[PDB]
Amino acid sequence: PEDFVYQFKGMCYFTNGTERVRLVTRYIYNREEYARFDSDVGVYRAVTPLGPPAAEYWNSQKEVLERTRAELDTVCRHNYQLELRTTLQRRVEPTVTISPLLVCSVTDFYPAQIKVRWFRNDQEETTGVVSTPLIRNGDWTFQILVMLEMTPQRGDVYTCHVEHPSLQNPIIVEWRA
Amino acid sequence: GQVELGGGPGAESCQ
Amino acid sequence: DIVADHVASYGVNLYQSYGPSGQYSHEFDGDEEFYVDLERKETVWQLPLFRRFRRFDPQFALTNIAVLKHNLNCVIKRSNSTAATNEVPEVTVFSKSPVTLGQPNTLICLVDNIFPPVVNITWLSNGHSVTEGVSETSFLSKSDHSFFKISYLTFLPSADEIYDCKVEHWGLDEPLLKHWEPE
Numbered sequence: 001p002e003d004f005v006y007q008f009k010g011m012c013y014f015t016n017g018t019e020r021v022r023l024v025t026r027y028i029y030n031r032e033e034y035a036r037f038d039s040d041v042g043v044y045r046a047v048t049p050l051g052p053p054a055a056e057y058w059n060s061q062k063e064v065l066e067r068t069r070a071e072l073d074t075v076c077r078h079n080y081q082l083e084l085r086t087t088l089q090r091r092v093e094p095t096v097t098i099s100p101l102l103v104c105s106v107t108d109f110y111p112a113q114i115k116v117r118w119f120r121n122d123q124e125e126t127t128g129v130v131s132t133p134l135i136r137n138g139d140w141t142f143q144i145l146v147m148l149e150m151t152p153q154r155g156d157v158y159t160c161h162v163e164h165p166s167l168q169n170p171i172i173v174e175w176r177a
Numbered sequence: 178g179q180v181e182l183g184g185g186p187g188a189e190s191c192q
Numbered sequence: 193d194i195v196a197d198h199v200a201s202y203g204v205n206l207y208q209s210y211g212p213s214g215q216y217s218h219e220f221d222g223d224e225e226f227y228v229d230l231e232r233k234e235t236v237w238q239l240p241l242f243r244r245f246r247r248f249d250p251q252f253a254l255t256n257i258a259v260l261k262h263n264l265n266c267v268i269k270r271s272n273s274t275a276a277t278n279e280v281p282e283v284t285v286f287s288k289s290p291v292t293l294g295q296p297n298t299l300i301c302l303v304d305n306i307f308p309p310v311v312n313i314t315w316l317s318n319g320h321s322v323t324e325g326v327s328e329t330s331f332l333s334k335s336d337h338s339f340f341k342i343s344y345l346t347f348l349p350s351a352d353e354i355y356d357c358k359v360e361h362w363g364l365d366e367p368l369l370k371h372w373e374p375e
């Protein structure tokens with residue numbers, strides 16, 4: 001079939017809390033951004049030759065230009081204060097298992113900050129450690145899989161140390177032959 | 178009781 | 193890309209002419225906080241935490257979709273009716289937890305690079321279609337303005353089961369059957 005798509009993306013970029021906030025609204029036709037308001041730029045700007053008509057019309061109207069600049073406060077800064085009350089306090093502790101070629105599965109944790117260290121006896125393993133990228137589960141939880149590419153000797157103890165903002169103490173799980 | 182807002186998109190002037 | 197601690201999508205507005213459909217959702221750091229049922233006119237938050245503390249009037253969503261519906265007709269004429277190009281979607285299937293036979297789990301089917309935002313995600317057990325224990329996310333935005341969607345299947349791992357995720361897209365010549373083995 002023949003389809004035509006339009007997208008509008010009001011994006012807010014936060015750095016160092018609310019010290020550095022930036023608003024970028026995006027007007028997209030199919031997969032092409034043709035116009036855009038960036039709060040750093042201050043006015044609408046065409047991105048492709050498809051957007052000079054919209055950008056010049058929106059900039060000429062004083063009431064449109066003020067309501068878009070005020071969105072940095074009414075939308076970006078205002079909603080962030082509600083994020084600090086809910087989303088930014090979410091703390092889901094990770095479940096950590098080890099299973100056979102040895103994988104330290106770290107599942108169902110949030111936020112995204114994570115740190116996985118493999119230990120061979122008393123020596124932290126720093127070479128043969130293949131870590132998959134952070135896997136977003138889409139239900140406000142993450143998981144990650146970290147492999148240790150050596151299990152040569154019997155009598156050696158292999159431990160996995162996981163650090164997360166939800167844990168006051170790291171999680172340690174051990175495996176033996 | 179703060180109601181969240183979104184970004185209101187501008188309207189093109191074609192018809 | 194742009195460097196920031198947190199990226200917020202306070203207005204993922206979408207409208208397309210195929211079977212006139214639209215979508216409105218707010219995202220924070222890659223996760224959907226809510227969407228609006230446009231026909232039911234209801235905000236549907238994605239976490240029990242948000243239903244308790246957060247409010248969004250669904251009327252504002254309906255206003256924006258009407259504006260996107262308007263702009264689309266304008267830009268369609270300015271572009272000489274340049275239709276969207278169908279992208280090839282990528283599918284991956286994995287479990288939420290390590291699979292222990294007997295312990296409840298959930299299978300996750302991630303479809304990525306979806307454009308246009310029209311897709312069928314369906315689960316099957318081993319020979320019959322699975323309708324129970326199936327949930328799906330809304331279309332989630334990406335930087336390059338494509339979409340990705342995730343479907344879930346709550347199941348109980350057993351020995352006589354190998355599950356498949358069926359993805360139907362226009363950019364695919366044939367339906368994609370992604371495979372997951374308990375072993």
Ligand SMILES: *[C@@H]1O[C@H](CO)[C@@H](O)[C@H](O)[C@H]1NC(C)=O
Nearest residue numbers: 310311312359360361362363
């Ligand atoms: C999705 O399924 C519907 C029937 O439920 C079908 O009409 C539509 O063409 C399908 N979409 C595809 C194959 O992209």
